[PDB]
Amino acid sequence: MDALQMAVGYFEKGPIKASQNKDKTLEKHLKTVENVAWKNGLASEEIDILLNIALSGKFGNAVNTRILKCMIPATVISEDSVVKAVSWLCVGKCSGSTKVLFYRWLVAMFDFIDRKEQINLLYGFFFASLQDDALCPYVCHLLYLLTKKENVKPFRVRKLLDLQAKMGMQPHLQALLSLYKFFAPALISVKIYFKNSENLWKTALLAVKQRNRSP
Amino acid sequence: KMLNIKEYKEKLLSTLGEFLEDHFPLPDVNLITLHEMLEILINRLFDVPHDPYVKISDSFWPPYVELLLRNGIALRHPEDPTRIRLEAFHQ
Amino acid sequence: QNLQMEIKITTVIQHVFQNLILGSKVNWAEDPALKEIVLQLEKNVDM
């Protein structure tokens, strides 16, 4: 094996028996992962494994939270991993704080996904999460980055206007609505700062890769 | 363009019917399938655009009606409880 | 009168299928056919 692959296999085996020395073992594996993640980053395959393991019902909330907070790519992120992550979110056996953290991660790791077309195909699943008022700002921040002209459908404009009437002219709602107005002015009249948009995954190497992302 | 839309619609309908039978089956009065209920709703939505409400009979499994209500698919009449309509997603 | 109303009906069917898939809480990525059909949704019928 290698030091990280042992931890990936341990997490793929799922939770084990009652803890005699298993707490220390889980801690060692998780510490190895994050050390590799915060030093030089993780590969696409390992991320594809661990992200979907964390977004599943396996393991407690602390393990999933730490896995999410150490999902830092060394190069790129596969869009199929994000599709499976959205499916796991649709499953429902995921914690609310875990969903908030995953949307924050998707916003922060947006420019590191190799392709975004299949993710844009999940615009309906992303938009249906606007009903939840705990995910509403983060979902709005994600849709502000994901929205193309083809996604601005009349039903979505109507529902977003109704949500604005219910919640009031919230900043994230107003930003998304201004984007919709830019794309489709005939369907309705009415990017940048969003609250709680601090990059929790900002390592130094991720910073140099983000600055290399601007040619 | 027309034939493309027709191929898509038929594919979508067949796969939707298979998904419904696989994930929303009847338990065993005479109940109708959820497919027939959705068909009635869709037909009334476009045949009578000015009154798309259909009356809820004993053949409508109440779990199916509540399922369509929770998922934003069906909407209740503001005054008549025996009537539900389909959400006009095309507008 | 056929094409426009069929476009509207196909949009309605898209939305109904998506809402039913969401309400069923099915891990649709595990089902290959369901996965390749979920990606068929969010297509503008008038294109």
From Swiss-Prot, chain A:
Whole sequence portion shown: 64 to 281 of 756
Protein location: Nucleus; Chromosome, Centromere
Disulfide bonding pattern of the chain: none
Organism ancestry: Eukaryota, Metazoa, Chordata, Craniata, Vertebrata
Organism: Homo sapiens (Human)
Modified how: Sumoylated. Sumoylated form can be polyubiquitinated by RNF4, leading to its degradation. Desumoylation by SENP6 prevents its degradation.
Induction and repression of expression: By follicle-stimulating hormone (FSH).
Segments traversing the membrane: none
Protein purpose: Component of the CENPA-CAD (nucleosome distal) complex, a complex recruited to centromeres which is involved in assembly of kinetochore proteins, mitotic progression and chromosome segregation. May be involved in incorporation of newly synthesized CENPA into centromeres via its interaction with the CENPA-NAC complex. Required for the localization of CENPF, MAD1L1 and MAD2 (MAD2L1 or MAD2L2) to kinetochores. Involved in the response of gonadal tissues to follicle-stimulating hormone.
Name this polypeptide is given: Centromere protein I
Family statement drawn from the similarity comment of this UniProt entry: Belongs to the CENP-I/CTF3 family.
Subunit text: Component of the CENPA-CAD complex, composed of CENPI, CENPK, CENPL, CENPO, CENPP, CENPQ, CENPR and CENPS. The CENPA-CAD complex interacts with the CENPA-NAC complex, at least composed of CENPA, CENPC, CENPH, CENPM, CENPN, CENPT and CENPU. Interacts with SENP6.
Top-level taxon: Eukaryota
From Swiss-Prot, chain B:
Any one Gene Ontology cellular component term annotated for this protein: nucleoplasm
Keywords from the UniProt entry: Centromere, Chromosomal rearrangement, Chromosome, Coiled coil, Kinetochore, Nucleus
Cellular compartments annotated: Nucleus; Chromosome, Centromere; Chromosome, Centromere, Kinetochore
Protein family (similarity comment): Belongs to the CENP-K/MCM22 family.
Primary localization: nucleus
Tissue-specificity statement: Detected in several fetal organs with highest levels in fetal liver. In adults, it is weakly expressed in lung and placenta.
Any one biological process term the GO annotation gives: chromosome segregation
Portion of the full-length sequence here: 165 to 269 of 269
Domain of life: Eukaryota
Associated pathology: Chromosomal aberrations involving CENPK are a cause of acute leukemias. Translocation t(5;11)(q12;q23) with KMT2A/MLL1.
Subunit text: Component of the CENPA-CAD complex, composed of CENPI, CENPK, CENPL, CENPO, CENPP, CENPQ, CENPR and CENPS. The CENPA-CAD complex interacts with the CENPA-NAC complex, at least composed of CENPA, CENPC, CENPH, CENPM, CENPN, CENPT and CENPU. Interacts directly with CENPH.
Name of the protein described by the UniProt record: Centromere protein K
Entry function: Component of the CENPA-CAD (nucleosome distal) complex, a complex recruited to centromeres which is involved in assembly of kinetochore proteins, mitotic progression and chromosome segregation. May be involved in incorporation of newly synthesized CENPA into centromeres via its interaction with the CENPA-NAC complex. Acts in coordination with KNL1 to recruit the NDC80 complex to the outer kinetochore.
Organism whose genome encodes this protein: Homo sapiens
Curated annotation (Swiss-Prot), chain C:
Localization, UniProt: Nucleus; Chromosome, Centromere, Kinetochore
Source species, domain of life: Eukaryota
Quaternary structure annotation from Swiss-Prot or TrEMBL: Self-associates. Component of the CENPA-NAC complex, at least composed of CENPA, CENPC, CENPH, CENPM, CENPN, CENPT and CENPU. The CENPA-NAC complex interacts with the CENPA-CAD complex, composed of CENPI, CENPK, CENPL, CENPO, CENPP, CENPQ, CENPR and CENPS. Interacts directly with CENPK. Interacts with KIF2C and NDC80. Interacts with TRIM36.
Role of this protein: Component of the CENPA-NAC (nucleosome-associated) complex, a complex that plays a central role in assembly of kinetochore proteins, mitotic progression and chromosome segregation. The CENPA-NAC complex recruits the CENPA-CAD (nucleosome distal) complex and may be involved in incorporation of newly synthesized CENPA into centromeres. Required for chromosome congression and efficiently align the chromosomes on a metaphase plate.
Family: Belongs to the CENP-H/MCM16 family.
The protein's name: Centromere protein H
Species name: Homo sapiens (Human)
UniProt lineage: Eukaryota, Metazoa, Chordata, Craniata, Vertebrata
Residues of the full protein shown: 200 to 246 of 247
